[PDB]
Scaffold this active site. Structure first.
Site, short mmCIF file in Angstrom:
data_model
loop_
_atom_site.label_atom_id
_atom_site.label_comp_id
_atom_site.label_asym_id
_atom_site.label_seq_id
_atom_site.Cartn_x
_atom_site.Cartn_y
_atom_site.Cartn_z
N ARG A 74 -9.97 -10.82 5.61
CA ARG A 74 -9.29 -11.08 4.29
C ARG A 74 -7.66 -10.66 4.54
NH1 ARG A 74 -7.14 -6.88 0.24
NH2 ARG A 74 -6.10 -8.45 -1.42
N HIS A 120 0.21 -11.54 -2.63
CA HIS A 120 0.26 -10.16 -2.20
C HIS A 120 1.66 -9.49 -2.04
CE1 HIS A 120 -2.48 -7.08 0.03
NE2 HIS A 120 -1.26 -6.39 -0.43
N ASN A 165 -3.18 -9.44 -5.83
CA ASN A 165 -3.85 -8.21 -5.05
C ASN A 165 -2.88 -7.01 -5.79
OD1 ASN A 165 -4.68 -6.31 -2.90
ND2 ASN A 165 -2.44 -6.08 -2.78
N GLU A 166 -3.63 -6.17 -6.41
CA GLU A 166 -3.08 -5.04 -6.96
C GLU A 166 -1.86 -5.24 -8.22
OE1 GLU A 166 -2.31 -1.97 -4.06
OE2 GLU A 166 -4.22 -1.64 -3.60
N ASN A 296 -10.09 -2.47 -4.79
CA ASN A 296 -9.32 -1.65 -3.88
C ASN A 296 -9.76 -0.27 -4.14
OD1 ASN A 296 -8.66 -4.11 -2.62
ND2 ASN A 296 -6.22 -3.87 -3.03
N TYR A 298 -9.35 3.99 -2.66
CA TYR A 298 -8.88 4.89 -1.66
C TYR A 298 -9.34 6.49 -1.74
CZ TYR A 298 -6.41 0.99 0.41
OH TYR A 298 -6.03 -0.26 0.96
N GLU A 367 -10.33 -3.70 -0.08
CA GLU A 367 -9.57 -2.62 0.60
C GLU A 367 -10.23 -1.22 0.67
OE1 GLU A 367 -5.39 -2.23 -0.06
OE2 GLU A 367 -4.95 -4.60 0.07
N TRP A 417 -9.22 -1.46 5.18
CA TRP A 417 -7.87 -1.54 5.26
C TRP A 417 -7.38 -0.53 6.46
CZ3 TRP A 417 -4.34 -4.83 3.56
CH2 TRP A 417 -3.00 -4.53 3.51
N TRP A 425 5.02 -1.03 3.55
CA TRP A 425 5.87 -1.00 2.55
C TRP A 425 7.12 0.02 2.41
CZ3 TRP A 425 5.08 -5.74 0.93
CH2 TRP A 425 3.69 -6.16 1.01
#
Length: 465
Positions: A74, A120, A165-166, A296, A298, A367, A417, A425
């Site tokens: 990806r 993205h 994305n997000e 995604n 986490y 992710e 990821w 970022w």
């Protein structure tokens, strides 16, 4: 006790995080190129001018992806490499297109299925300046739609597409807290941005299905992040509701309109007029605009209802996002990310949550991964060790397995990821998320970590041959 054989697994990156070469082959500036230029916005005062130099090392990354046995990969398209000024009336850059067209061919030749993210976060700066970028209800969805069309034509061999994305990040962090590009801070604009992202998504999906989808039996979807929730005090129904509402503000914000056809009722009752209404045209674009669910995930949190009424600048849904519950229990150990604490059970719970709410759609885990506390400040071959990350992947993937084999969650894919340490970022390079150590002090040499090699046998076990 076995996942389907056509279960895709691999790794995930984003263009601005690994590519570098920001002023190469006619690439226009994105909002993140400008954002990093602002002092104080990035922790380590850095940007993505070099990053992993992946724009120049396509053969090297592809070889790495093979080395770890990835079935899929990806990555995202840098919009300003295809259309430097971004707009549907602007010159299209062939060298940008060729770079990715060759990258897809190189992947296809090396039996690695490309999963491509159209957007993205790296919106062309010109669009932001021309008409307000993401904030513009009329112009942005039309420009995105065209940019999607261009990429659909440019890459006929690709059968797996992601629009955004997000969007939650682009809206809340980009226009609410201002921690991400373009760094605006508003009590109204994030809810307007979120709406525009949705319409743009719907527009691109329709164009794909009508003109490109049946050409090679492909699929398109949006990618939504979201951490699972548990009541801070389960004896208090206000906390049970809070935990549910918090998922609604984070995730159902985008998914309810895409599947049910309207925003979550809970959001409408807190935001009121600040939350836009879908026109018939807009609704017709958005409703049913997912071939698959891009996910995604986490971590997870304890959610405590707040005693005071929701403030104007609230974005999480008037709740407290915590790591300890009333009994003193802890979600998980400490990582390099103050917001991320490991919780494999929450992964499976979110999968089942999505499935129950949206009639068990096809899900791709686009992710999943973790940072590691103090990882950046320790010797080289001690970075190659990452037992903490190894354990993270072991338990999370097995939790996903249970979700698929027991609950029957229709998850068809998983992407770790990330392929390698990259520009995180606002955190810069201090925070490492990769399974491959990138040596920035010495020209971004790729050194796979213990977790990178651990994914092959783990998936060998769980998939059925």
């Amino acid at each position: 006790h076995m996942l389907p054989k056509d279960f895709q697994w691999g790794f995930a990156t984003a263009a601005y995080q690994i590519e570098g070469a920001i002023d190469k082959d006619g690439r226009g500036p994105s909002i993140w190129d400008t954002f990093c230029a602002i002092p104080g916005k990035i922790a380590d005062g850095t940007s993505g001018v070099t990053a992993c130099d992946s724009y120049n090392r396509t053969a090297e990354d592809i070889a790495l992806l093979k080395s770890l046995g990835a079935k899929s990969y990806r990555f995202s398209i840098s919009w300003s490499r295809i259309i430097p000024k971004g707009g549907r009336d602007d010159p299209v850059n062939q060298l940008g297109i060729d770079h990715y067209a060759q990258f897809v061919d190189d992947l296809l030749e090396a039996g690695i299925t490309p999963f491509i993210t159209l957007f993205h976060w790296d919106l062309p700066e010109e669009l932001h300046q021309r008409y307000g970028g993401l904030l513009n209800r009329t112009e942005f969805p039309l420009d995105f739609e065209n940019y999607a069309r261009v990429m659909f034509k440019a890459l006929p061999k690709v059968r797996n597409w992601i629009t955004f994305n997000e969007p939650w990040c682009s809206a809340i962090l980009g226009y609410g807290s201002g921690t991400f590009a373009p760094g605006r801070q508003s009590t109204t604009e994030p809810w307007i941005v979120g709406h525009n992202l949705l319409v743009a998504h719907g527009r691109a999906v329709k164009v794909y299905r009508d003109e490109f989808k049946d050409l090679n039996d492909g699929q398109i979807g949006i990618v939504l992040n979201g951490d699972f929730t548990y009541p801070w005090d389960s004896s208090d129904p206000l906390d049970r509701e809070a935990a549910e509402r918090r998922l609604e503000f984070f995730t159902a914000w985008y998914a309810d309109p895409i599947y049910l056809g309207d925003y979550p009722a809970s959001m409408r009752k807190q935001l009121g007029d600040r939350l836009p209404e879908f026109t018939p045209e807009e609704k017709a674009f958005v409703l049913g605009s997912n071939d698959f669910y891009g996910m995604n995930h986490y971590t997870s949190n304890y959610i405590r209802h707040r005693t005071s009424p929701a403030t104007a600048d609230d974005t999480v849904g008037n709740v407290d996002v915590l790591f300890y519950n009333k009994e003193g229990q802890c979600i998980g150990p400490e990582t390099e990310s103050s917001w991320l604490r490991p919780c494999p059970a929450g992964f499976r719970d979110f999968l089942v949550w999505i499935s129950k709410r949206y009639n068990y759609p096809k899900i791709y885990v686009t992710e999943n991964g973790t940072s590691l506390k103090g990882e950046n400040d320790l010797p080289k071959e001690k970075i190659l060790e990452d037992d903490f990350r190894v354990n993270y992947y072991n338990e999370y993937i097995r939790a996903m397995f249970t979700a698929a084999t027991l609950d029957g969650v229709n998850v068809k894919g998983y992407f770790a990821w990330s392929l390698m340490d990259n520009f995180e970022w606002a955190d810069g390079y201090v925070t490492r998320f990769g399974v491959t150590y990138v040596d920035y002090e010495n020209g971004q040499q790729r050194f796979p970590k213990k977790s990178a090699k651990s994914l092959k046998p783990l998936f060998d076990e769980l998939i059925a041959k």
